[PDB]
């Protein structure tokens, strides 16, 4: 599987940008490793 | 697949803590579903 973080800015080291996600009905980055 | 949010107020009822995370140099719950 995949562990993904829904982040307010960009993705961390070694994380993949796996499209976007929503938090508080606002666009965020889906960062997965 | 797991999607995790670093939440200022804590985890939704359908989420579960999964350790902590940092946000604005402050410690918060990491909440995943």
Numbering used by the authors:
A (entry chain A), B (entry chain B): 3 to 35
Original authors' sentences:
Mouse α-defensins, better known as cryptdins, are host protective antimicrobial peptides produced in the intestinal crypt by Paneth cells. Mammalian defensins of 2 to 5 kDa in size are rich in Arg and/or Lys residues with three intramolecular disulfide bonds and are classified into α, β, and θ subfamilies according to their disulfide topology and sites of expression. Cryptdins are initially synthesized as inactive precursors, i.e., procryptdins, which are proteolytically processed to their active mature forms by matrix metalloproteinase 7 (MMP-7 or matrilysin).
Crp14 adopts a disulfide-stabilized, three-stranded β-sheet core structure and forms a noncanonical dimer stabilized by asymmetrical interactions between the two β1 strands in parallel. Arg9 and Glu17 form a salt bridge that is conserved in all mammalian α-defensins. This salt bridge rigidifies the first loop connecting β1-β2 (56, 66) and is additionally stabilized by a Lys14 O accepting H-bond from Glu17 N and a Lys14 N donating H-bond to Glu17 Oε1. As shown in the electrostatic potential map, Crp14 is clearly amphiphilic with a cluster of positively charged residues well segregated from a large hydrophobic surface. Crp14 dimerization is mediated primarily by interactions between the two β1 strands in parallel, in contrast to the dimers of other known α-defensins that dimerize via the interactions of the two β2 strands in antiparallel. Four asymmetric main chain-main chain H-bonds form the basis of the dimer interface, i.e., Leu4a O-Leu4b N, Cys6a N-Leu4b O, Cys6a O-Cys6b N, and Cys8a N-Cys6b O. In addition, Asp3b N donates an H-bond to Asp3a Oδ1 and the side chain of Tyr7 packs against neighboring disulfide bonds in both copies. However, the total buried surface area (BSA) for both dimers is similar, 724 Å2 for the Crp14 dimer compared to 744 Å2 for HNP1.
